[PDB]
Amino acid sequence: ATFEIVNRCSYTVWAAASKGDAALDAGGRQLNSGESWTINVEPGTNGGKIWARTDCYFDDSGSGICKTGDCGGLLRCKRFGRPPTTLAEFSLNQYGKDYIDISNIKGFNVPMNFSPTTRGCRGVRCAADIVGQCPAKLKAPGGGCNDACTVFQTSEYCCTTGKCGPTEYSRFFKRLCPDAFSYVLDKPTTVTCPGSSNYRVTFCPTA
């Protein structure tokens, strides 16, 4: 499947793409304002994620640091990124269906739209100003709004027993972005698409 990754933000982002144990395509690239990066993702990819990283400095061998979403200091991500990161998540060709979602379970850094470019399902968006509205206790100094699990490390926020409810903090993410996962056991906002669909991820889809 092909994913077009579009930076509509007025600022530079460093896109990342990974399934957690391996890069997807090149795994990462600088995107200036307006740039598009087309990647190929092998069919049957399970647990793939796309995200943006902000305020990165890399040297000549693709080694450095980003203020949000850093994946162990690499330009080309092999691992998932450090919170806070708005996530586009996907599992492809799972019994003839593709499954896509946006998640705030690892916080929010950049607004995002995740839409098919082929027929037969709708897209999902989280475009509210979560950073501006972020509760003071979740505000990340680097920029971004952390999830409560990352900040507080309790069984309830992290749902480590497999039983957990919504919280004051999850409800904040949910009120601004009803179409994104706000906590681990949130009622799924997954969208089912035809197997082998194609997609666009757009950062800052509004402004």
Side-chain angles (χ1 to χ4, degrees):
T2 73
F3 282 75
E4 182 177 54
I5 303 175
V6 176
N7 183 18
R8 193 176 292 155
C9 307
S10 60
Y11 48 85
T12 296
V13 303
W14 284 261
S18 178
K19 57 180 184 78
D21 61 353
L24 299 179
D25 202 287
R29 223 200 75 183
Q30 185 173 326
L31 294 177
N32 297 151
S33 180
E35 294 192 317
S36 308
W37 175 42
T38 295
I39 68 166
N40 261 74
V41 174
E42 237 218 321
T45 301
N46 202 93
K49 298 185 200 311
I50 287 164
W51 68 104
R53 302 163 285 171
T54 55
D55 293 301
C56 298
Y57 302 85
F58 298 103
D59 65 22
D60 302 290
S61 69
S63 218
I65 186 49
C66 300
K67 289 207 186 171
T68 65
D70 187 70
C71 58
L74 303 173
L75 175 44
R76 297 167 160 173
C77 299
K78 282 170 144 95
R79 298 267 150 166
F80 297 136
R82 184 164 194 276
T85 53
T86 318
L87 298 170
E89 301 184 315
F90 47 91
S91 284
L92 309 178
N93 307 285
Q94 300 301 307
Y95 304 94
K97 294 307 173 190
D98 288 357
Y99 294 101
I100 72 164
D101 71 80
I102 291 175
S103 170
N104 290 139
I105 285 156
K106 301 275 177 210
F108 174 104
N109 63 162
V110 171
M112 171 192 290
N113 179 95
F114 187 4
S115 290
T117 53
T118 47
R119 49 186 35 82
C121 45
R122 32 89 97 202
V124 280
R125 171 174 294 198
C126 171
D129 184 19
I130 293 197
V131 184
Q133 294 307 350
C134 184
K137 274 166 182 156
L138 303 181
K139 278 225 200 77
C145 187
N146 283 307
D147 63 286
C149 172
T150 295
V151 177
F152 290 109
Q153 296 281 278
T154 69
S155 297
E156 195 59 19
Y157 296 141
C158 303
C159 306
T160 36
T161 79
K163 291 138 135 218
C164 59
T167 65
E168 206 73 338
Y169 300 120
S170 72
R171 285 182 186 101
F172 158 76
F173 290 94
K174 203 56 166 193
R175 178 170 60 76
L176 296 190
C177 283
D179 285 320
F181 278 92
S182 65
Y183 72 107
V184 176
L185 300 191
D186 208 346
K187 173 144 81 75
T189 46
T190 305
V191 169
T192 305
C193 289
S196 284
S197 298
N198 294 324
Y199 301 96
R200 184 179 281 116
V201 182
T202 305
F203 301 125
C204 304
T206 295

PDB file of all heavy atoms in Angstrom, residues 20-60:
ATOM      1  N   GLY A  20       7.626  -0.691  14.975  1.00  0.00           N
ATOM      2  CA  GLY A  20       8.128  -0.930  16.329  1.00  0.00           C
ATOM      3  C   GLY A  20       9.415  -1.719  16.421  1.00  0.00           C
ATOM      4  O   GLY A  20      10.247  -1.447  17.284  1.00  0.00           O
ATOM      5  N   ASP A  21       9.585  -2.689  15.527  1.00  0.00           N
ATOM      6  CA  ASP A  21      10.836  -3.458  15.462  1.00  0.00           C
ATOM      7  C   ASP A  21      11.592  -3.209  14.151  1.00  0.00           C
ATOM      8  O   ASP A  21      12.610  -3.812  13.907  1.00  0.00           O
ATOM      9  CB  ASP A  21      10.559  -4.953  15.682  1.00  0.00           C
ATOM     10  CG  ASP A  21       9.623  -5.566  14.625  1.00  0.00           C
ATOM     11  OD1 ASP A  21       9.048  -4.862  13.761  1.00  0.00           O
ATOM     12  OD2 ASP A  21       9.463  -6.801  14.661  1.00  0.00           O
ATOM     13  N   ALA A  22      11.095  -2.294  13.320  1.00  0.00           N
ATOM     14  CA  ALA A  22      11.638  -2.079  11.980  1.00  0.00           C
ATOM     15  C   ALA A  22      11.062  -0.783  11.432  1.00  0.00           C
ATOM     16  O   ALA A  22       9.869  -0.505  11.652  1.00  0.00           O
ATOM     17  CB  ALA A  22      11.232  -3.227  11.058  1.00  0.00           C
ATOM     18  N   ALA A  23      11.883  -0.060  10.661  1.00  0.00           N
ATOM     19  CA  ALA A  23      11.444   1.055   9.812  1.00  0.00           C
ATOM     20  C   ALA A  23      10.399   0.599   8.797  1.00  0.00           C
ATOM     21  O   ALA A  23      10.425  -0.569   8.356  1.00  0.00           O
ATOM     22  CB  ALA A  23      12.629   1.655   9.083  1.00  0.00           C
ATOM     23  N   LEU A  24       9.472   1.496   8.445  1.00  0.00           N
ATOM     24  CA  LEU A  24       8.648   1.345   7.238  1.00  0.00           C
ATOM     25  C   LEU A  24       9.232   2.267   6.174  1.00  0.00           C
ATOM     26  O   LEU A  24       9.408   3.475   6.393  1.00  0.00           O
ATOM     27  CB  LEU A  24       7.187   1.702   7.494  1.00  0.00           C
ATOM     28  CG  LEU A  24       6.483   0.828   8.554  1.00  0.00           C
ATOM     29  CD1 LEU A  24       5.039   1.286   8.762  1.00  0.00           C
ATOM     30  CD2 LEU A  24       6.571  -0.676   8.247  1.00  0.00           C
ATOM     31  N   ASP A  25       9.592   1.682   5.037  1.00  0.00           N
ATOM     32  CA  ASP A  25      10.246   2.397   3.973  1.00  0.00           C
ATOM     33  C   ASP A  25      11.530   2.945   4.586  1.00  0.00           C
ATOM     34  O   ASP A  25      12.132   2.266   5.409  1.00  0.00           O
ATOM     35  CB  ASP A  25       9.289   3.478   3.446  1.00  0.00           C
ATOM     36  CG  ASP A  25       9.635   3.928   2.041  1.00  0.00           C
ATOM     37  OD1 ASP A  25      10.638   4.637   1.896  1.00  0.00           O
ATOM     38  OD2 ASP A  25       8.887   3.605   1.096  1.00  0.00           O
ATOM     39  N   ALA A  26      11.939   4.169   4.258  1.00  0.00           N
ATOM     40  CA  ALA A  26      13.134   4.776   4.872  1.00  0.00           C
ATOM     41  C   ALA A  26      13.013   5.058   6.380  1.00  0.00           C
ATOM     42  O   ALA A  26      14.035   5.272   7.048  1.00  0.00           O
ATOM     43  CB  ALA A  26      13.516   6.048   4.133  1.00  0.00           C
ATOM     44  N   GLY A  27      11.791   5.089   6.917  1.00  0.00           N
ATOM     45  CA  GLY A  27      11.580   5.252   8.378  1.00  0.00           C
ATOM     46  C   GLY A  27      11.476   6.683   8.898  1.00  0.00           C
ATOM     47  O   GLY A  27      10.935   6.925   9.980  1.00  0.00           O
ATOM     48  N   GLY A  28      11.996   7.643   8.152  1.00  0.00           N
ATOM     49  CA  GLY A  28      11.950   9.016   8.594  1.00  0.00           C
ATOM     50  C   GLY A  28      12.461   9.967   7.530  1.00  0.00           C
ATOM     51  O   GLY A  28      13.307   9.594   6.745  1.00  0.00           O
ATOM     52  N   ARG A  29      11.923  11.187   7.500  1.00  0.00           N
ATOM     53  CA  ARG A  29      12.389  12.224   6.576  1.00  0.00           C
ATOM     54  C   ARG A  29      11.992  13.607   7.063  1.00  0.00           C
ATOM     55  O   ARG A  29      10.932  13.763   7.679  1.00  0.00           O
ATOM     56  CB  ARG A  29      11.765  12.026   5.201  1.00  0.00           C
ATOM     57  CG  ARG A  29      12.812  12.223   4.117  1.00  0.00           C
ATOM     58  CD  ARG A  29      12.131  12.509   2.798  1.00  0.00           C
ATOM     59  NE  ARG A  29      11.605  13.878   2.746  1.00  0.00           N
ATOM     60  CZ  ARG A  29      10.916  14.367   1.719  1.00  0.00           C
ATOM     61  NH1 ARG A  29      10.665  13.583   0.678  1.00  0.00           N
ATOM     62  NH2 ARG A  29      10.510  15.640   1.729  1.00  0.00           N
ATOM     63  N   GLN A  30      12.831  14.595   6.786  1.00  0.00           N
ATOM     64  CA  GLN A  30      12.435  15.996   6.943  1.00  0.00           C
ATOM     65  C   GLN A  30      11.352  16.379   5.927  1.00  0.00           C
ATOM     66  O   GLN A  30      11.487  16.067   4.738  1.00  0.00           O
ATOM     67  CB  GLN A  30      13.637  16.905   6.749  1.00  0.00           C
ATOM     68  CG  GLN A  30      13.340  18.379   7.015  1.00  0.00           C
ATOM     69  CD  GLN A  30      14.598  19.208   6.984  1.00  0.00           C
ATOM     70  OE1 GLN A  30      15.643  18.748   7.378  1.00  0.00           O
ATOM     71  NE2 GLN A  30      14.501  20.424   6.493  1.00  0.00           N
ATOM     72  N   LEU A  31      10.291  17.024   6.407  1.00  0.00           N
ATOM     73  CA  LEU A  31       9.259  17.643   5.573  1.00  0.00           C
ATOM     74  C   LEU A  31       9.111  19.100   5.904  1.00  0.00           C
ATOM     75  O   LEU A  31       8.568  19.467   6.972  1.00  0.00           O
ATOM     76  CB  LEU A  31       7.873  16.981   5.748  1.00  0.00           C
ATOM     77  CG  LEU A  31       7.679  15.542   5.290  1.00  0.00           C
ATOM     78  CD1 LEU A  31       6.265  15.130   5.641  1.00  0.00           C
ATOM     79  CD2 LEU A  31       7.850  15.416   3.783  1.00  0.00           C
ATOM     80  N   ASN A  32       9.572  19.961   4.991  1.00  0.00           N
ATOM     81  CA  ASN A  32       9.288  21.398   5.115  1.00  0.00           C
ATOM     82  C   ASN A  32       7.830  21.624   4.845  1.00  0.00           C
ATOM     83  O   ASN A  32       7.136  20.732   4.331  1.00  0.00           O
ATOM     84  CB  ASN A  32      10.152  22.211   4.142  1.00  0.00           C
ATOM     85  CG  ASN A  32      11.619  22.059   4.467  1.00  0.00           C
ATOM     86  OD1 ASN A  32      12.447  22.150   3.606  1.00  0.00           O
ATOM     87  ND2 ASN A  32      11.934  21.818   5.713  1.00  0.00           N
ATOM     88  N   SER A  33       7.371  22.812   5.170  1.00  0.00           N
ATOM     89  CA  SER A  33       6.002  23.214   4.951  1.00  0.00           C
ATOM     90  C   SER A  33       5.572  23.033   3.508  1.00  0.00           C
ATOM     91  O   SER A  33       6.166  23.639   2.620  1.00  0.00           O
ATOM     92  CB  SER A  33       5.864  24.684   5.331  1.00  0.00           C
ATOM     93  OG  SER A  33       4.525  25.070   5.123  1.00  0.00           O
ATOM     94  N   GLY A  34       4.582  22.175   3.279  1.00  0.00           N
ATOM     95  CA  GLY A  34       4.071  21.880   1.922  1.00  0.00           C
ATOM     96  C   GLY A  34       4.618  20.596   1.312  1.00  0.00           C
ATOM     97  O   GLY A  34       4.086  20.105   0.309  1.00  0.00           O
ATOM     98  N   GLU A  35       5.701  20.047   1.874  1.00  0.00           N
ATOM     99  CA  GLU A  35       6.307  18.891   1.228  1.00  0.00           C
ATOM    100  C   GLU A  35       5.464  17.606   1.436  1.00  0.00           C
ATOM    101  O   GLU A  35       4.763  17.454   2.456  1.00  0.00           O
ATOM    102  CB  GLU A  35       7.744  18.702   1.706  1.00  0.00           C
ATOM    103  CG  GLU A  35       8.707  19.834   1.275  1.00  0.00           C
ATOM    104  CD  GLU A  35      10.151  19.454   1.508  1.00  0.00           C
ATOM    105  OE1 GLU A  35      10.493  18.883   2.565  1.00  0.00           O
ATOM    106  OE2 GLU A  35      10.956  19.661   0.596  1.00  0.00           O
ATOM    107  N   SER A  36       5.559  16.700   0.478  1.00  0.00           N
ATOM    108  CA  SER A  36       4.906  15.392   0.489  1.00  0.00           C
ATOM    109  C   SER A  36       5.971  14.314   0.331  1.00  0.00           C
ATOM    110  O   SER A  36       6.971  14.463  -0.433  1.00  0.00           O
ATOM    111  CB  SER A  36       3.921  15.250  -0.660  1.00  0.00           C
ATOM    112  OG  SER A  36       3.024  16.338  -0.689  1.00  0.00           O
ATOM    113  N   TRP A  37       5.761  13.244   1.077  1.00  0.00           N
ATOM    114  CA  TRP A  37       6.666  12.117   1.070  1.00  0.00           C
ATOM    115  C   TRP A  37       5.817  10.888   0.884  1.00  0.00           C
ATOM    116  O   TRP A  37       4.954  10.593   1.707  1.00  0.00           O
ATOM    117  CB  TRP A  37       7.435  12.058   2.375  1.00  0.00           C
ATOM    118  CG  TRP A  37       8.365  10.857   2.584  1.00  0.00           C
ATOM    119  CD1 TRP A  37       9.207  10.273   1.672  1.00  0.00           C
ATOM    120  CD2 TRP A  37       8.569  10.168   3.823  1.00  0.00           C
ATOM    121  NE1 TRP A  37       9.904   9.242   2.266  1.00  0.00           N
ATOM    122  CE2 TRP A  37       9.551   9.168   3.590  1.00  0.00           C
ATOM    123  CE3 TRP A  37       8.039  10.317   5.110  1.00  0.00           C
ATOM    124  CZ2 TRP A  37       9.987   8.290   4.597  1.00  0.00           C
ATOM    125  CZ3 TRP A  37       8.462   9.442   6.122  1.00  0.00           C
ATOM    126  CH2 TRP A  37       9.421   8.428   5.853  1.00  0.00           C
ATOM    127  N   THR A  38       6.064  10.202  -0.225  1.00  0.00           N
ATOM    128  CA  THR A  38       5.330   8.992  -0.592  1.00  0.00           C
ATOM    129  C   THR A  38       6.110   7.758  -0.161  1.00  0.00           C
ATOM    130  O   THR A  38       7.281   7.612  -0.535  1.00  0.00           O
ATOM    131  CB  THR A  38       5.099   8.972  -2.122  1.00  0.00           C
ATOM    132  OG1 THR A  38       4.249  10.061  -2.443  1.00  0.00           O
ATOM    133  CG2 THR A  38       4.361   7.708  -2.533  1.00  0.00           C
ATOM    134  N   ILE A  39       5.477   6.894   0.636  1.00  0.00           N
ATOM    135  CA  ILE A  39       6.136   5.664   1.086  1.00  0.00           C
ATOM    136  C   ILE A  39       5.350   4.415   0.668  1.00  0.00           C
ATOM    137  O   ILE A  39       4.139   4.473   0.465  1.00  0.00           O
ATOM    138  CB  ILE A  39       6.422   5.641   2.611  1.00  0.00           C
ATOM    139  CG1 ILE A  39       5.114   5.568   3.428  1.00  0.00           C
ATOM    140  CG2 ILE A  39       7.347   6.807   2.986  1.00  0.00           C
ATOM    141  CD1 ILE A  39       5.311   5.208   4.908  1.00  0.00           C
ATOM    142  N   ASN A  40       6.054   3.300   0.540  1.00  0.00           N
ATOM    143  CA  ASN A  40       5.401   2.013   0.319  1.00  0.00           C
ATOM    144  C   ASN A  40       5.514   1.163   1.575  1.00  0.00           C
ATOM    145  O   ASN A  40       6.574   1.116   2.189  1.00  0.00           O
ATOM    146  CB  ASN A  40       6.036   1.302  -0.865  1.00  0.00           C
ATOM    147  CG  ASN A  40       5.222   1.484  -2.124  1.00  0.00           C
ATOM    148  OD1 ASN A  40       5.218   2.562  -2.733  1.00  0.00           O
ATOM    149  ND2 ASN A  40       4.471   0.440  -2.495  1.00  0.00           N
ATOM    150  N   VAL A  41       4.411   0.528   1.962  1.00  0.00           N
ATOM    151  CA  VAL A  41       4.312  -0.273   3.190  1.00  0.00           C
ATOM    152  C   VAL A  41       3.889  -1.624   2.671  1.00  0.00           C
ATOM    153  O   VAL A  41       2.954  -1.721   1.863  1.00  0.00           O
ATOM    154  CB  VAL A  41       3.263   0.303   4.179  1.00  0.00           C
ATOM    155  CG1 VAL A  41       3.055  -0.621   5.385  1.00  0.00           C
ATOM    156  CG2 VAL A  41       3.677   1.708   4.669  1.00  0.00           C
ATOM    157  N   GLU A  42       4.608  -2.658   3.092  1.00  0.00           N
ATOM    158  CA  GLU A  42       4.346  -4.009   2.625  1.00  0.00           C
ATOM    159  C   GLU A  42       2.925  -4.452   3.023  1.00  0.00           C
ATOM    160  O   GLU A  42       2.458  -4.136   4.132  1.00  0.00           O
ATOM    161  CB  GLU A  42       5.370  -4.946   3.226  1.00  0.00           C
ATOM    162  CG  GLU A  42       6.170  -5.718   2.185  1.00  0.00           C
ATOM    163  CD  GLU A  42       6.465  -7.158   2.615  1.00  0.00           C
ATOM    164  OE1 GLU A  42       6.757  -7.408   3.817  1.00  0.00           O
ATOM    165  OE2 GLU A  42       6.393  -8.054   1.741  1.00  0.00           O
ATOM    166  N   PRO A  43       2.203  -5.135   2.115  1.00  0.00           N
ATOM    167  CA  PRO A  43       0.906  -5.674   2.541  1.00  0.00           C
ATOM    168  C   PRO A  43       1.052  -6.628   3.742  1.00  0.00           C
ATOM    169  O   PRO A  43       2.114  -7.242   3.937  1.00  0.00           O
ATOM    170  CB  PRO A  43       0.377  -6.423   1.290  1.00  0.00           C
ATOM    171  CG  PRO A  43       1.429  -6.289   0.247  1.00  0.00           C
ATOM    172  CD  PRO A  43       2.369  -5.188   0.654  1.00  0.00           C
ATOM    173  N   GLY A  44       0.003  -6.725   4.552  1.00  0.00           N
ATOM    174  CA  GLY A  44       0.055  -7.560   5.737  1.00  0.00           C
ATOM    175  C   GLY A  44       0.783  -6.904   6.900  1.00  0.00           C
ATOM    176  O   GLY A  44       0.915  -7.527   7.952  1.00  0.00           O
ATOM    177  N   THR A  45       1.232  -5.649   6.759  1.00  0.00           N
ATOM    178  CA  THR A  45       1.852  -4.952   7.899  1.00  0.00           C
ATOM    179  C   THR A  45       0.852  -4.764   9.046  1.00  0.00           C
ATOM    180  O   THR A  45      -0.287  -4.250   8.868  1.00  0.00           O
ATOM    181  CB  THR A  45       2.495  -3.598   7.513  1.00  0.00           C
ATOM    182  OG1 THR A  45       3.497  -3.829   6.512  1.00  0.00           O
ATOM    183  CG2 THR A  45       3.155  -2.908   8.752  1.00  0.00           C
ATOM    184  N   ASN A  46       1.296  -5.202  10.219  1.00  0.00           N
ATOM    185  CA  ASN A  46       0.470  -5.184  11.394  1.00  0.00           C
ATOM    186  C   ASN A  46       1.087  -4.244  12.417  1.00  0.00           C
ATOM    187  O   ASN A  46       2.284  -4.336  12.678  1.00  0.00           O
ATOM    188  CB  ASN A  46       0.396  -6.592  11.974  1.00  0.00           C
ATOM    189  CG  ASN A  46      -0.817  -6.774  12.838  1.00  0.00           C
ATOM    190  OD1 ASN A  46      -1.857  -7.218  12.356  1.00  0.00           O
ATOM    191  ND2 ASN A  46      -0.714  -6.392  14.112  1.00  0.00           N
ATOM    192  N   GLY A  47       0.287  -3.342  12.976  1.00  0.00           N
ATOM    193  CA  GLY A  47       0.791  -2.428  14.014  1.00  0.00           C
ATOM    194  C   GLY A  47       1.775  -1.383  13.490  1.00  0.00           C
ATOM    195  O   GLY A  47       2.757  -1.056  14.158  1.00  0.00           O
ATOM    196  N   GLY A  48       1.530  -0.861  12.288  1.00  0.00           N
ATOM    197  CA  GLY A  48       2.344   0.233  11.744  1.00  0.00           C
ATOM    198  C   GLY A  48       1.880   1.552  12.350  1.00  0.00           C
ATOM    199  O   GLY A  48       0.686   1.705  12.690  1.00  0.00           O
ATOM    200  N   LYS A  49       2.820   2.495  12.534  1.00  0.00           N
ATOM    201  CA  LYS A  49       2.454   3.825  13.021  1.00  0.00           C
ATOM    202  C   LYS A  49       3.183   4.913  12.217  1.00  0.00           C
ATOM    203  O   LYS A  49       4.366   4.739  11.888  1.00  0.00           O
ATOM    204  CB  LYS A  49       2.750   3.998  14.533  1.00  0.00           C
ATOM    205  CG  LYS A  49       1.967   3.033  15.481  1.00  0.00           C
ATOM    206  CD  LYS A  49       2.224   3.368  16.959  1.00  0.00           C
ATOM    207  CE  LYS A  49       1.903   2.229  17.939  1.00  0.00           C
ATOM    208  NZ  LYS A  49       0.571   1.675  17.677  1.00  0.00           N
ATOM    209  N   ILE A  50       2.476   6.018  11.956  1.00  0.00           N
ATOM    210  CA  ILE A  50       3.095   7.224  11.353  1.00  0.00           C
ATOM    211  C   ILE A  50       2.897   8.373  12.349  1.00  0.00           C
ATOM    212  O   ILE A  50       1.808   8.498  12.936  1.00  0.00           O
ATOM    213  CB  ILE A  50       2.481   7.521   9.950  1.00  0.00           C
ATOM    214  CG1 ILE A  50       3.015   6.468   8.940  1.00  0.00           C
ATOM    215  CG2 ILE A  50       2.757   8.988   9.502  1.00  0.00           C
ATOM    216  CD1 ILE A  50       2.225   6.372   7.617  1.00  0.00           C
ATOM    217  N   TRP A  51       3.945   9.176  12.551  1.00  0.00           N
ATOM    218  CA  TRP A  51       3.855  10.385  13.408  1.00  0.00           C
ATOM    219  C   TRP A  51       4.808  11.475  12.937  1.00  0.00           C
ATOM    220  O   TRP A  51       5.691  11.234  12.103  1.00  0.00           O
ATOM    221  CB  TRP A  51       4.108  10.056  14.914  1.00  0.00           C
ATOM    222  CG  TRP A  51       5.539   9.627  15.285  1.00  0.00           C
ATOM    223  CD1 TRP A  51       6.492  10.391  15.908  1.00  0.00           C
ATOM    224  CD2 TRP A  51       6.148   8.342  15.046  1.00  0.00           C
ATOM    225  NE1 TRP A  51       7.655   9.664  16.086  1.00  0.00           N
ATOM    226  CE2 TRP A  51       7.473   8.402  15.571  1.00  0.00           C
ATOM    227  CE3 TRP A  51       5.698   7.145  14.443  1.00  0.00           C
ATOM    228  CZ2 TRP A  51       8.365   7.326  15.506  1.00  0.00           C
ATOM    229  CZ3 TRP A  51       6.585   6.043  14.391  1.00  0.00           C
ATOM    230  CH2 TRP A  51       7.915   6.150  14.925  1.00  0.00           C
ATOM    231  N   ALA A  52       4.635  12.673  13.509  1.00  0.00           N
ATOM    232  CA  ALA A  52       5.487  13.800  13.231  1.00  0.00           C
ATOM    233  C   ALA A  52       6.385  13.997  14.424  1.00  0.00           C
ATOM    234  O   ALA A  52       5.988  13.727  15.561  1.00  0.00           O
ATOM    235  CB  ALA A  52       4.634  15.051  12.996  1.00  0.00           C
ATOM    236  N   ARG A  53       7.585  14.474  14.179  1.00  0.00           N
ATOM    237  CA  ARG A  53       8.474  14.913  15.260  1.00  0.00           C
ATOM    238  C   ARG A  53       8.756  16.382  15.047  1.00  0.00           C
ATOM    239  O   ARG A  53       8.838  16.833  13.900  1.00  0.00           O
ATOM    240  CB  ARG A  53       9.783  14.109  15.227  1.00  0.00           C
ATOM    241  CG  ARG A  53       9.563  12.605  15.361  1.00  0.00           C
ATOM    242  CD  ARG A  53      10.784  11.831  14.921  1.00  0.00           C
ATOM    243  NE  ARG A  53      10.983  11.784  13.459  1.00  0.00           N
ATOM    244  CZ  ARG A  53      12.086  11.311  12.867  1.00  0.00           C
ATOM    245  NH1 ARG A  53      13.124  10.868  13.596  1.00  0.00           N
ATOM    246  NH2 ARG A  53      12.154  11.288  11.548  1.00  0.00           N
ATOM    247  N   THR A  54       8.932  17.126  16.137  1.00  0.00           N
ATOM    248  CA  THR A  54       9.120  18.595  16.070  1.00  0.00           C
ATOM    249  C   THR A  54      10.458  18.928  16.674  1.00  0.00           C
ATOM    250  O   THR A  54      10.959  18.186  17.558  1.00  0.00           O
ATOM    251  CB  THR A  54       8.001  19.367  16.792  1.00  0.00           C
ATOM    252  OG1 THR A  54       7.911  18.899  18.156  1.00  0.00           O
ATOM    253  CG2 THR A  54       6.648  19.092  16.077  1.00  0.00           C
ATOM    254  N   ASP A  55      11.039  20.005  16.145  1.00  0.00           N
ATOM    255  CA  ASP A  55      12.284  20.623  16.655  1.00  0.00           C
ATOM    256  C   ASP A  55      13.419  19.628  16.752  1.00  0.00           C
ATOM    257  O   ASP A  55      13.937  19.381  17.825  1.00  0.00           O
ATOM    258  CB  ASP A  55      12.059  21.294  18.024  1.00  0.00           C
ATOM    259  CG  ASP A  55      11.160  22.485  17.944  1.00  0.00           C
ATOM    260  OD1 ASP A  55      11.487  23.438  17.221  1.00  0.00           O
ATOM    261  OD2 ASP A  55      10.114  22.471  18.596  1.00  0.00           O
ATOM    262  N   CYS A  56      13.827  19.118  15.604  1.00  0.00           N
ATOM    263  CA  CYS A  56      14.852  18.101  15.533  1.00  0.00           C
ATOM    264  C   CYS A  56      16.150  18.738  15.054  1.00  0.00           C
ATOM    265  O   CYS A  56      16.113  19.705  14.313  1.00  0.00           O
ATOM    266  CB  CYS A  56      14.453  17.035  14.512  1.00  0.00           C
ATOM    267  SG  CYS A  56      12.938  16.142  14.884  1.00  0.00           S
ATOM    268  N   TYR A  57      17.272  18.178  15.488  1.00  0.00           N
ATOM    269  CA  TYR A  57      18.609  18.515  14.980  1.00  0.00           C
ATOM    270  C   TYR A  57      19.258  17.179  14.740  1.00  0.00           C
ATOM    271  O   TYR A  57      19.335  16.349  15.645  1.00  0.00           O
ATOM    272  CB  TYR A  57      19.423  19.369  15.972  1.00  0.00           C
ATOM    273  CG  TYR A  57      18.710  20.684  16.329  1.00  0.00           C
ATOM    274  CD1 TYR A  57      17.752  20.706  17.351  1.00  0.00           C
ATOM    275  CD2 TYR A  57      18.964  21.919  15.625  1.00  0.00           C
ATOM    276  CE1 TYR A  57      17.061  21.873  17.688  1.00  0.00           C
ATOM    277  CE2 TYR A  57      18.267  23.111  15.960  1.00  0.00           C
ATOM    278  CZ  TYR A  57      17.314  23.069  16.999  1.00  0.00           C
ATOM    279  OH  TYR A  57      16.577  24.158  17.434  1.00  0.00           O
ATOM    280  N   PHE A  58      19.684  16.961  13.507  1.00  0.00           N
ATOM    281  CA  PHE A  58      20.433  15.791  13.134  1.00  0.00           C
ATOM    282  C   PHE A  58      21.735  16.241  12.498  1.00  0.00           C
ATOM    283  O   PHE A  58      21.775  17.268  11.815  1.00  0.00           O
ATOM    284  CB  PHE A  58      19.625  14.936  12.153  1.00  0.00           C
ATOM    285  CG  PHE A  58      18.338  14.414  12.726  1.00  0.00           C
ATOM    286  CD1 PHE A  58      17.124  15.003  12.393  1.00  0.00           C
ATOM    287  CD2 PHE A  58      18.339  13.332  13.607  1.00  0.00           C
ATOM    288  CE1 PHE A  58      15.926  14.521  12.906  1.00  0.00           C
ATOM    289  CE2 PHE A  58      17.147  12.859  14.145  1.00  0.00           C
ATOM    290  CZ  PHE A  58      15.933  13.440  13.785  1.00  0.00           C
ATOM    291  N   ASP A  59      22.805  15.489  12.745  1.00  0.00           N
ATOM    292  CA  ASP A  59      24.076  15.727  12.069  1.00  0.00           C
ATOM    293  C   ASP A  59      24.062  15.047  10.691  1.00  0.00           C
ATOM    294  O   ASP A  59      23.002  14.617  10.193  1.00  0.00           O
ATOM    295  CB  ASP A  59      25.256  15.255  12.945  1.00  0.00           C
ATOM    296  CG  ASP A  59      25.268  13.740  13.189  1.00  0.00           C
ATOM    297  OD1 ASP A  59      24.666  12.931  12.414  1.00  0.00           O
ATOM    298  OD2 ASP A  59      25.913  13.357  14.193  1.00  0.00           O
ATOM    299  N   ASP A  60      25.244  14.913  10.100  1.00  0.00           N
ATOM    300  CA  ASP A  60      25.393  14.332   8.766  1.00  0.00           C
ATOM    301  C   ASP A  60      25.146  12.831   8.649  1.00  0.00           C
ATOM    302  O   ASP A  60      24.826  12.371   7.566  1.00  0.00           O
ATOM    303  CB  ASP A  60      26.737  14.743   8.156  1.00  0.00           C
ATOM    304  CG  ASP A  60      26.878  16.249   8.068  1.00  0.00           C
ATOM    305  OD1 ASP A  60      26.166  16.881   7.247  1.00  0.00           O
ATOM    306  OD2 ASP A  60      27.680  16.799   8.854  1.00  0.00           O
TER     307      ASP A  60
END
